[PDB]
Write a protein that binds this ligand. Structure first.
Ligand SMILES: Cc1ccc(S[C@@H]2O[C@H](CO)[C@H](O)[C@H](n3cc(-c4ccc(F)c(F)c4)nn3)[C@H]2O)cc1
Ligand SMILES: [Cl-]
Length: 138
């Protein structure tokens, strides 16, 4: 397995038609997972499954600018399960990141950070065994 937290460089940033695929297995009794598409110290797109926020499972998405988190976008569709293998696909589209889990569309996140070619790393963190993280053009 890859070491978590894992840094995946995205050379030259992201661009529409770039597909990022993350394969892993959620740990038993997981609490949290996070993907962080980063522009330097800013987080253009934070995708954060929370397994127990007040006894609810929720995905929280947000952007961090100058160390400040913005308005959260929340999704109660929660496709992850403790102990189980998953696939996350993040497709960069012109106006949003489009996320599918286990081949099922989950959510879109509109681009708040608009300099896509400066979003040049992806961090992967939290309660997973990480099998692979890669990108390709479709
Ligand atoms: C005013 C205020 C008060 C409280 C908050 S809470 C905050 O909410 C954010 C989204 O709005 C992020 O989720 C933040 N966060 C999570 C992780 C994180 C690290 C490692 C992992 F493995 C993981 F799974 C997640 N790092 N940073 C969280 O602290 C926010 C604003
Ligand atoms: Cl969290």
């Amino acid at each position: 397995p890859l070491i978590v937290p894992y840094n995946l460089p995205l050379p030259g940033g992201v661009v529409p038609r770039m597909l990022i695929t993350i394969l892993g297995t959620v740990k038993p009794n997981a609490n949290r997972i996070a993907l962080d598409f980063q522009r330097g110290n800013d987080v253009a797109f934070h995708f954060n499954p929370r397994f127990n926020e007040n006894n609810r499972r929720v995905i929280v998405c947000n952007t961090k600018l100058d160390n400040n988190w913005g308005r959260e976008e929340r999704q109660s569709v929660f496709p992850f399960e403790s102990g189980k293998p998953f696939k996350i696909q993040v497709l960069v589209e012109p106006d949003h990141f489009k996320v599918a889990v286990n081949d099922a569309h989950l959510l879109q996140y509109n681009h708040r950070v608009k300099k896509l070619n400066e979003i040049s790393k992806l961090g992967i963190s939290g309660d997973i065994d990480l099998t692979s993280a890669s990108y390709t053009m479709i």
